[model samples]
Target chain A: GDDRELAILATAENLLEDRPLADISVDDLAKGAGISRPTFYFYFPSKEAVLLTLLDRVVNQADMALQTLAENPADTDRENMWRTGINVFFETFGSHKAVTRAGQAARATSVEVAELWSTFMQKWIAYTAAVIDAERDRGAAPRTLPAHELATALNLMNERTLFASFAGEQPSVPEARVLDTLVHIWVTSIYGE
Target chain B: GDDRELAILATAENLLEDRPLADISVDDLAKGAGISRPTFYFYFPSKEAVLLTLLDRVVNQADMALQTLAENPADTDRENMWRTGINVFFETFGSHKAVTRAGQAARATSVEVAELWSTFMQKWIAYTAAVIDAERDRGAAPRTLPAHELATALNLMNERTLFASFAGEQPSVPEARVLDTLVHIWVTSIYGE
Candidate 1:
């Protein structure tokens, strides 16, 4: 029973690798999964839900680096800590472009997917703010915009740029420069030059 | 000769102030403009185009603050200059919330309106990058991320933050904190603390 579900997900991953979610139909997914068209519905209710599940995987793994930083706020070299997190972020999203793009395509119609990402971002904003607060308390970074607002802006920057880079029809930053641009701002803003 | 077009534009402004673009119909716009539905098409090709025109006024006013900053990159006090630019930016968009939100709503279906705003954003990004370049050229700021990329991320933050603050269904930053938070990031990112 679960085999069909796994096959459906794998089929989506394969199909989306080649084309956008909008171009792929339910029958196409059923055929790709080697299951009867009606059986596909038993495994997945809607194609949009498949995309939502795919996005869940990305978000599930994407926060590890940030969690690492939050846990070790002062233990790691700040520059190196930022590098690890930003690289992991870009790399994680980059490797999963097909799934990520599917999430973007489905966001318009799926309120669940939209809020799922928003909820992840809220947690991220809080975690980053907590670290920033610790930075100010320990005399590592000055209190400027207050921890929460600064972290909110920083994480929103990450959110928008990543969307522009991977999932969007147009990109805001070149892939060549994204890593450094983000690192520079986080470093400069948090710890100053 | 153009009174009907003006009335249609004003009608959109009046209606969108009270409701979202999706809830208002072409008939509503026409009726509000004191014209027939068919006549509405003659003045504004689609209700979406009405939003494009509404956005035209805001995007037109958008660059003056950046222009002032670019013209006098090293002349004004950096802190005060940022306050001026960000203030003008939020005010210009805040005063035109209905129109701005309409553009945001219309953007989902209207290519021209979406690109219209993107084109304005491109120009703003270039001017801001040029000013950042000037800051480094004149030895006022350090060279970290190249001028273009840094300004790209920086301006993108402003873009996303303002969208959340003034236009989006959910705000990322509280209104009370928006001004200072933006000013801090800009000040800290461009010049050392």
Candidate 2:
């Protein structure tokens, strides 16, 4: 049972490595997975659905990390909290880097996929806004910056981080610098330097 | 003189508002401008070329504003510099807001447009990186942040700003707060407050 699902994902990953996600057809995906086209259709409706599945996997993993941090808020400092979150994203997607890169190319190329990505990012940013609110409530951060702006900022940071992570490029500063930038923004945005 | 170009751009603007840029045909664009389809092709090589012309106009205006700041670096105080830069952007595209919105749609629908947008932003980011470097050299800011990260940060801020501006929505606190956030990041990322 699990093998079938893994087989589908693995095959899609391999095919995507050769070309962009938009270039892969449902029939091609099925052939690559060693299944009938009808069987592939039975599992997923559209090529977009495959990407949706991949995103869900990544989001679910991120959710779990965020859940742990939520449950034990004081168990780790903010830096670790961020690093852990980034690590989750990196570890999960690093295995399928080419596939993810292809997906981004396809996403940027289609109005439907691009809008989907925008909507997805909007929800993620709202979640970050909520996290900023939680920290404010905990007195971990001052309340000068509103949640919406903080949310957008964190979302933007996450975007850049994702680009670097997906491309296997390192940020100019240490990996810790990202967290430091986040912390510096949190503190200073609330209190004038 | 300028009115002839203004008339054609105005007609292009109307068509852009009613439909996605990619969906607008040469026939419709020409008809809107009261010219034959063949005549439209005479002035512009293709539909995309016209859009590129518009982008060039908008960027040229901003480039002049940037040059003004460089000429009088001392006058590049916080508010004035930002106001000049953003105001040029606002005024340049205000009359063709629909086209600006459509450009976003076009980028998603057309690979050529997306690549063009990406390349333009890449150049803009590089220019901003140099600006940040200059800021550090002038002894006005610290040298804590490397230029590339600062460049990415600036690109993100610009993306957020342009998205909202073309959103045709109200100028909410989130918008202003983003600008404030940009200033905060620029100051702190360099100065390390």
lDDT of each: 0.79, 0.61
Candidate 2, residues B41-130, lDDT tens digits: the string is 777788777776666666566667666756775555654565555455555555557766666656545676666666656666677777
* Candidate 1 residue runs with Cα over 4 Å from true position: A64-76, A167-171, B64-76, B168-171
**Candidate 1, CAPRI quality class derived from DockQ:** medium
Residue pairs with colliding backbones in model 2 are none
Evaluated with lDDT, which candidate comes out highest? 1
lDDT of 2 by residue, A58-109 (tens): 5566657666656775567675655555555555555557755655656545
Interface RMSD of each: 2.7, 5.2
Q: What's the distance in Å from true for residue B67, model 1?
A: 4.1
Candidate 2 global CA lDDT score: 0.61
TM-score of chain B of 1: 0.89
Error of 2 at A8 (Å): 2.8
